[PDB]
Amino acid sequence: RVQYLRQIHANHETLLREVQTLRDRLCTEDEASSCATAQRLLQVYRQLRHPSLILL
Amino acid sequence: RRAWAELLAGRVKREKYNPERAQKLKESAVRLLRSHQDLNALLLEVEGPVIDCDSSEAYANHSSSFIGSALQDQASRLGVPVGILSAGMVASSVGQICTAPPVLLTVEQRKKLSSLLEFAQYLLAHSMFSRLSFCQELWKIQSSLLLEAVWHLHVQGIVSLQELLESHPDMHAVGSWLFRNLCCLCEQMEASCQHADVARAMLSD
Amino acid sequence: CLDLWREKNDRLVRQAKVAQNSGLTLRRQQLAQDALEGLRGLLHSLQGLPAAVPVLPLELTVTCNFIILRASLAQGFTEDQAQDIQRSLERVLETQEQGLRELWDSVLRASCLLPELLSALHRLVGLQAALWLSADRLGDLALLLETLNGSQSGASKDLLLLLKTWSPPAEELDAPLTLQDAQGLKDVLLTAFAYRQGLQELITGNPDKALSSLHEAASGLCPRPVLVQVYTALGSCHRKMGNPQRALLYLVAALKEGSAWGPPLLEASRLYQQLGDTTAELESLELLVEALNVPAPQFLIEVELLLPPPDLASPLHCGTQSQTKHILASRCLQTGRAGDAAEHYLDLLALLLDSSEPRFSPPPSPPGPCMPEVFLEAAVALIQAGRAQDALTLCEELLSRTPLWVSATHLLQGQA
Numbered sequence: 001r002v003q004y005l006r007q008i009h010a011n012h013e014t015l016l017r018e019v020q021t022l023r024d025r026l027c028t029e030d031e032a033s034s035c036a037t038a039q040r041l042l043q044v045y046r047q048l049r050h051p052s053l054i055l056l
Numbered sequence: 057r058r059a060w061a062e063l064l065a066g067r068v069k070r071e072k073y074n075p076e077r078a079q080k081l082k083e084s085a086v087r088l089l090r091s092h093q094d095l096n097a098l099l100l101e102v103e104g105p106v107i108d109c110d111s112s113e114a115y116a117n118h119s120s121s122f123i124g125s126a127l128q129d130q131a132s133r134l135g136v137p138v139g140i141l142s143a144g145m146v147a148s149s150v151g152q153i154c155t156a157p158p159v160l161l162t163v164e165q166r167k168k169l170s171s172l173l174e175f176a177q178y179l180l181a182h183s184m185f186s187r188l189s190f191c192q193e194l195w196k197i198q199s200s201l202l203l204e205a206v207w208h209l210h211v212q213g214i215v216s217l218q219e220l221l222e223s224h225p226d227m228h229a230v231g232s233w234l235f236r237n238l239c240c241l242c243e244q245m246e247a248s249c250q251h252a253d254v255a256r257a258m259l260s261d
Numbered sequence: 262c263l264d265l266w267r268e269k270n271d272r273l274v275r276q277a278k279v280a281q282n283s284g285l286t287l288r289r290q291q292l293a294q295d296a297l298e299g300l301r302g303l304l305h306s307l308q309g310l311p312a313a314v315p316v317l318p319l320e321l322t323v324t325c326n327f328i329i330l331r332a333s334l335a336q337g338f339t340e341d342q343a344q345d346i347q348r349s350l351e352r353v354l355e356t357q358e359q360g361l362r363e364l365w366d367s368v369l370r371a372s373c374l375l376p377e378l379l380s381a382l383h384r385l386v387g388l389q390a391a392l393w394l395s396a397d398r399l400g401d402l403a404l405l406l407e408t409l410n411g412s413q414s415g416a417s418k419d420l421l422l423l424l425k426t427w428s429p430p431a432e433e434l435d436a437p438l439t440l441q442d443a444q445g446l447k448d449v450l451l452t453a454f455a456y457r458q459g460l461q462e463l464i465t466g467n468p469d470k471a472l473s474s475l476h477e478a479a480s481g482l483c484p485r486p487v488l489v490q491v492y493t494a495l496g497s498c499h500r501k502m503g504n505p506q507r508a509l510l511y512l513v514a515a516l517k518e519g520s521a522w523g524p525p526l527l528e529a530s531r532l533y534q535q536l537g538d539t540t541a542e543l544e545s546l547e548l549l550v551e552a553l554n555v556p557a558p559q560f561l562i563e564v565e566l567l568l569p570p571p572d573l574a575s576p577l578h579c580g581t582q583s584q585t586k587h588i589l590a591s592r593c594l595q596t597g598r599a600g601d602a603a604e605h606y607l608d609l610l611a612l613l614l615d616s617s618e619p620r621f622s623p624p625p626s627p628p629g630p631c632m633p634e635v636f637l638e639a640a641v642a643l644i645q646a647g648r649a650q651d652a653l654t655l656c657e658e659l660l661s662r663t664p665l666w667v668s669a670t671h672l673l674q675g676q677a
Contacts, residue, residue: 021187021219023183029137063607063651065608068612069615073554081551082517085526085552090509090513092509093506093509097505098507
């Protein structure tokens with residue numbers, strides 16, 4: 001169908017732009033490279049890994 | 057006493073602060089100190105009297121890895137993070153290309169643009185690119201730009217229109233600038249069916 | 262018996278460090294002022310003995326711990342500590358008169374006889390020098406250290422090189438404890454003198470010589486409040502030279518690393534004034550107004566002890582919300598945003614007059630213009646806005662409360 005594929009695309013692009021802003025803040029030494037960065041990315045990792053690659 | 061009653065003000069007394077508002081303040085302050093920063097000026101300060109030409113040293117080669125190490129050398133001297141140098145230089149070269157002569161630009165402009173964007177992608181891969189600095193440095197231009205250029209940025213995946221249009225100070229200025237550009241466009245896409253393809257693509261986008 | 266006194270020292274130093282690490286605001290000071298009196302009593306017991314060569318390396322240890330802990334808790338020094346040091350040195354001599362300078366001359370020749378307590382003596386020198394460097398006696402300080410090292414070092418009248426030439430004579434080998442040692446205080450000396458030299462040269466109009474010593478500040482201990490202030494200082498150097506884009510570097514670093522980002526936003530206001538970026542200036546100060554709303558000690562000589570409280574002439578001077586809100590409204594009014602300026606003036610004036618119940622806002626120094634001047638500036642703002650009935654209320658109020666300002670009162674009342 002279409003609804004489900006667009007659900008997935010939008011769910012991904014929100015994360016992607018969020019990650020991208022996060023990458024630039026790491027370029028400008030804005031935020032930190034202590035941590036909570038690391039702990040943020042290990043939250044994105046877990047979000048995605050639950051239904052990784054439904055194969056049809 | 058009516059005098060007094062008319063003076064007696066209200067939002068005058070203020071107290072406690074949220075430590076999130078502290079970072080918000082510091083963030084809007086840092087944002088301000090960089091917005092009224094310019095990099096051209098910085099280069100003219102430390103080094104006495106910027107282009108790919110400047111960094112690469114009078115058309116040495118056009119190799120991506122070469123030019124990367126040049127930006128490392130530059131940033132090492134200036135003590136600025138390599139991202140913003142790269143952003144400013146690329147935006148200066150965008151201004152150059154877009155100025156040398158209405159909406160579209162589809163000969164040789166496209167070719168220069170694509171070779172420059174080919175290097176933007178290398179820069180992003182190696183983490184030598186601030187998107188946000190770049191968006192700021194484009195809104196500093198804001199007139200030279202063509203909607204074709206911005207659509208190439210969008211589709212090549214260097215900015216998203218959402219990240220650009222939400223990083224301009226005056227939202228009304230963006231609105232009016234687009235309004236005029238889109239009016240000129242929908243007047244165009246009648247000049248030829250070839251240019252109409254690209255115009256219709258970016259319009260639908 | 263040396264062992265007992267030694268034991269006591271050990272015990273109480275450890276007790277003090279325990280208070281330093283652990284503890285609440287009250288319990289900290291309780292155990293600290295306990296250890297303090299322990300060390301007092303010990304001092305008095307040892308001050309009850311004649312001389313004792315083997316005791317001195319302990320007594321001096323003890324006096325040093327005493328002074329440190331004394332000064333650390335006071336968050337400031339006194340002259341009793343000079344007399345403490347006076348007593349210690351006089352005792353040193355009375356083993357083997359005039360004042361501290363000739364005492365130290367005779368003392369340091371008495372140390373070139375080679376009694377192994379130099380670890381302590383050099384610590385005393387550190388502490389003495391901290392009093393003289395809190396009290397602006399830099400000529401005597403350099404003299405003391407010239408005496409300490411070879412007097413061949415007679416022409417090095419710069420401190421910042423003598424302080425580095427000065428070499429602690431041990432790694433402080435297995436002797437009694439201390440709260441702090443020679444190197445650990447040398448490291449505070451160099452940073453404190455560098456900071457002080459820098460601020461004097463800056464205000465005195467050498468934003469050229471500053472840069473040297475303000476780099477020597479960050480290169481050696483800089484507790485992060487010392488870095489924040491070194492960076493505002495370098496922003497000021499470059500702004501005065503006409504190098505705004507370099508100044509912006511150091512000021513963004515100070516924003517990031519600091520918990521008090523008033524003095525940098527002030528420096529930014531002055532930068533945009535110098536240029537003419539009046540919108541940027543006004544927005545920087547708006548943020549500073551918001552920023553001055555929002556807001557720890559060690560039983561050890563830190564550096565923030567050996568720094569002065571800033572002059573009005575310093576780049577580090579920051580007033581109160583009221584002092585700054587007036588600067589914003591003044592700087593808004595002169596630019597011609599009279600409506601915003603008038604609103605700001607009204608919300609300034611209410612903050613001073615309606616304030617009986619809340620915390621009373623402090624006056625913005627003796628140099629700042631008198632109360633009536635401020636009512637007049639407010640009325641001008643009100644006029645510029647076109648808020649004439651409000652200006653009439655202002656003027657009525659002033660004359661009800663109470664020369665040039667009276668005549669002027671009537672004038673602005675008329676313009677209303």
